[PDB]
DNA sequence: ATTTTGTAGCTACTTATACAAAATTCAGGAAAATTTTTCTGTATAATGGGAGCTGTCACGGATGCA
DNA sequence: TGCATCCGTGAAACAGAAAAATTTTCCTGAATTTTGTATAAGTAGCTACAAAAT
């Protein structure tokens, strides 16, 4: 689940920083790109970013 | 960030000081200087035109408005006023201009002077009460010329002696030596400025090898300064100074107060003082008053200056209408409250909210209560955004208004804005990193913050009235790492020690205790038998057994019992797999039967709960 | 069998132009008027202030020393 | 010279004057509309008219 994904995400990746930031900017793009595509009000671009980086990417 | 790399601490030579306020204009004639100590006019309130708030040298307080007038709009910007020479440039140009005072007398920087090493002295090789005398007009010095005769160099003529130096007058033999009797810093000046120093750190270093068991400390010191100076471009003379910078006015702001009264700033005060003293003194030499006034005078000036720099340093702490020591330049950037330490490492941000605190049962961990009142404001904008997204709100003021109307959205949209959006909580200033973590803001009614027990220890909270404080993160990136790495879930254990820190702590322990204890006499459902399914449970709601009641339970897994028993006891040697064997807890079937076909555990029906409860929470 | 369609047509007929001085006002100037700010004097004689505060430290210095 | 003390840290005058200012006036001047006013056609009208569809 996203929670365990969020865990697995950084349970087997680069510096926990290093990750984040790239999670971050990603979502940044996930927000910039697809700007207000699917409302996303619920699945924050960050959340997206995470899942698509903690499961999709994995 | 990419504007500069390193800073360059140092001193401000009189050119650089006067280079803090030139504001030369296209009429071509320089300014930045202030010829008046007074502040805004009495009739109107405008800033004189050469006082502590002269616009034309700091800037038009009224955005694009030549103090003269004629222009009251950005339209007139680069263009200035002929008549006033006001530099029309909005108003933020102030708070940064600086201006300065040509000094009618030099002043040995308090800092270099009464300093721990009194560098001045360190370089003058002359202790205080001697060089300290020289300022303060209190003695004299021979001067290099003054002592070219019987006089001995750096001999303090004080005054009586100095007069005796005037005695034995040149009307007699000899007395052809020179002058510069050091009554004032004006001479300490050319002391400094006298000396060369390339010889120091080498010709002086001649010593340093020698005098093996000599003072040593003295010298090397005296070096390292010197050396330093020469190493930098520092000529000691720069230390005394001659012209004074001046704070962009508004930082010494001064302000109309509603009731009409005004908010004077000690800055302009110290200042203005030294102005007078100065001017006046110039008028004293202008009127060629007999010294001892003018002398006195300088002395004063001197320390007016001084106090400005640093009140209370040396002479008598100035005490104005504030009915207390004033607040010199130094001290506003010093102490516990020097600029540094409190506005600067500790500023005082918004997007926050405090409150009392209260246990938030029902609400799980990694969540927080949140009152509705505060949650709005914290989230203010974000929400309005969502308005406009949903379109319900058109402009903002639209929103604004609607926000106060608490339309359905206000308590509907919001919380969609909100979840996901971590928040950070903190119980008072907290060194510990875990002292503050990330949290999911869930709305809640009254006004407290709900709060989870498991996290309580970390923050160390009572609930006797503590309070906490909230902040909220913005960039999205900054959200990320809330989640990612402060989210109060994921931090279980003390960073100071692998130990966990979440730990069910009180009563909840004793729940568990009491759950799992071992009431003696346990009879109801004691010595009973069970086989998975959580059977025994059912029995429990049907009280088939007692919460506290030893009973066999089919469980093929492992115990741990405490009080290990591993070895058998009283194996039941009968038939197939019937060694079948006891244990202080177990009871089991190996041999022919198999390996462990039987597996009844001697455990109370609580403990089974517990075990269960974990269990399922854990894997599945 | 009138009517609407016409075509071959204009004339009336009316924008359009552009100028245009005339208004017609406005701004700035200039005073000038005056109000407010400054400046200066003052004659018996007069000749050192105020305060208090009195409970850490340290250190390095502490030169100062005996 | 280690061993004093001992810096000072982290916690109400005035009248007389004048001169300023300033400031109201002006005025004025110009600059700036509007309107008059042409202006000039072209015109889009419009008004009969005519044959051929009710």
Q: Is A10 on the interface with B (CB under 8 A)?
A: yes
Q: Which residue has the tokens 């499961």?
A: A55
Query: Chain A: nearest CA to B214, how far in angstroms?
Result: 57
Closest CA to B74 of B59, B57, B86, B91: B91
Contact B268, B39 (CB under 8 A): yes
Nearest-angstrom CA–CA distance, B463 and B163: 79
Nearest-angstrom CA–CA distance, B487 and A33: 27
Judging contacts by C-beta atoms under 8 Å, the chain B residues touching residue A23 are 480, 484
Nearest-angstrom CA–CA distance, B225 and B214: 19
Contact B490, B481 (CB under 8 A): no
Cα distance between the two ends of chain B: 51
Contact between chains at A46 and B386 (C-beta distance less than 8 A): no
Nearest-angstrom CA–CA distance, B204 and B211: 12
CA B354, B489, B613, B588 torsion-angle sign: negative
Contact between chains at B389 and A36 (C-beta distance less than 8 A): yes
Report the b/e string of B491-524 with b at 16+ CB within 10 A: beeeeeeeeebbeeeeeeeeebeebbeeeeebee
Q: Is A47 on the interface with B (CB under 8 A)?
A: yes
Contact B208, B220 (CB under 8 A): yes
Contact B528, B549 (CB under 8 A): yes
Contact A10, A19 (CB under 8 A): yes
Q: Which of B480, B490, B619 to mutate to test the interface with A (most CBs of A within 10 A)?
A: B480
Nearest-angstrom CA–CA distance, B63 and B69: 12
For residue B220, give Cα distances in angstroms to B25, B123, B136, B197. 50, 12, 30, 15
Contact B458, B397 (CB under 8 A): no
Which residue of chain A comes nearest to B482, CA vs CA? A20
Calculate ∠ Cα B457-B458-B464, nearest 5°. Answer: 50
Nearest-angstrom CA–CA distance, B89 and B62: 9
Query: Chain A: nearest CA to B508, how far in angstroms?
Result: 26
Judging contacts by C-beta atoms under 8 Å, the chain A residues touching residue B389 are 36, 39, 41
Given resolution (angstroms): 3.6
Closest CA to B205 of B224, B189, B191: B224
Give phi and psi for B543, each to the nearest 5: 55, 15
The HSE-up count of residue B536 (CA atoms within 13 Å, CB side) is 33
Closest CA to B154 of B173, B136, B180, B174: B180
């Amino acid at each position: 689940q996203i929670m365990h994904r969020a865990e697995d995400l950084i349970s087997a990746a680069s510096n926990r920083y290093r990750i984040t930031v790239q999670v971050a900017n990603r979502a940044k793009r996930r927000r910039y790109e697809e700007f207000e595509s699917a409302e996303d009000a619920m699945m924050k671009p960050v959340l997206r970013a995470i899942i698509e980086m903690s499961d999709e990417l994995t | 960030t990419n504007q500069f790399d390193y800073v360059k601490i140092g001193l401000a030579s009189p050119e650089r000081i006067r280079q803090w306020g030139e504001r030369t204009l296209p009429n071509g004639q320089v300014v930045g200087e202030v010829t008046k100590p007074e502040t805004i006019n009495y009739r109107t309130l405008k800033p004189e035109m050469d006082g502590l708030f002269c616009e034309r040298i700091f800037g038009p307080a009224k955005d694009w408005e030549c103090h003269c007038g004629k222009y009251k709009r950005v339209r007139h910007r680069g263009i200035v006023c002929e008549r006033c020479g006001v530099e029309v440039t909005e108003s933020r140009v102030r708070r940064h201009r600086m201006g300065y005072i040509k000094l009618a007398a030099p002043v040995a920087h308090v800092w270099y002077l009464k300093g721990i090493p009194s560098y001045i002295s360190i370089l003058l090789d002359m202790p205080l009460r001697d060089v300290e005398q020289i300022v303060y007009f209190n003695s004299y010095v021979v001067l290099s010329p003054g002592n070219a005769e019987t006089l001995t160099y750096k001999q303090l003529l004080s005054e009586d002696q100095w007069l005796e130096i005037e005695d034995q007058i040149y009307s007699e033999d000899s007395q052809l030596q020179g002058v510069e009797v050091g009554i004032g810093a004006e001479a300490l000046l050319r002391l400094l400025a006298d000396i060369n120093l390339e010889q120091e750190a080498e010709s002086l270093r001649e010593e340093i090898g020698s005098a093996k068991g000599q003072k040593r400390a003295k010298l090397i010191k005296r070096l390292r300064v010197i050396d330093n100076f020469i190493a930098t471009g520092s000529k000691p003379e720069w230390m005394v100074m001659t012209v004074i910078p001046v704070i962009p006015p508004d930082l010494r702001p001064m302000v109309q107060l509603d009731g009409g009264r005004f908010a004077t700033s000690d800055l302009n005060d110290l200042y203005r003082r030294v102005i007078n003293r100065n001017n006046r003194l110039a008028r004293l030499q202008e009127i060629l008053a007999p010294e001892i006034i003018v002398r006195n005078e300088k002395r004063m000036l001197q320390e007016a200056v001084d106090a400005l720099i640093d009140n209370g340093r040396r002479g008598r702490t100035v005490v104005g209408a504030n009915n207390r020591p004033l607040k010199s330049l130094s001290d506003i950037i010093e102490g516990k409250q020097g600029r540094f330490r409190q506005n600067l490492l500790g500023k005082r941000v918004d997007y926050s909210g405090r409150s009392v605190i209260v246990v938030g049962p029902k609400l799980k961990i990694h969540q927080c209560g949140l009152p509705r009142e505060m949650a709005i404001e914290l989230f203010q904008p974000f929400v309005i955004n969502r308005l406009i997204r949903s379109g319900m709100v058109n402009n903002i003021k639209a929103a604004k208004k609607l926000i106060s109307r608490n339309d359905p959205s206000v308590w509907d949209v919001l919380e969609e804005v909100i979840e996901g959006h971590p928040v950070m909580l903190n119980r008072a200033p907290t060194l510990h990193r875990l002292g503050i973590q990330a949290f999911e803001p869930i709305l809640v009614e009254g006004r407290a913050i709900q709060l989870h027990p498991l996290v309580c220890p970390a923050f160390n909270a009572d609930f006797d009235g503590d309070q906490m404080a909230v902040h909220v993160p913005l960039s999205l990136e900054s959200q990320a790492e809330a989640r990612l790495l402060m989210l109060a879930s994921n931090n279980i254990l003390s960073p100071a020690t692998g130990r966990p820190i979440i730990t069910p702590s009180q009563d909840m322990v004793l729940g568990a205790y009491y759950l799992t204890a071992e009431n003696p006499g346990a009879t109801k459902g004691a010595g009973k038998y069970f086989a998975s399914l959580d059977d025994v449970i059912m029995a429990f709601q049907q009280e088939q057994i007692d919460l506290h009641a030893y009973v066999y339970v089919r469980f093929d897994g492992d115990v741990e019992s405490d009080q290990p028993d591993t070895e058998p006891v009283k194996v039941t040697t009968n038939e197939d797999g019937s060694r079948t064997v006891l244990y202080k807890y177990r009871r089991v079937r190996e041999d022919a039967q198999g390996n462990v076909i039987s597996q009844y555990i001697y455990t109370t029906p609580g403990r089974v709960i517990y075990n269960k409860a974990i269990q399922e929470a854990l894997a599945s």
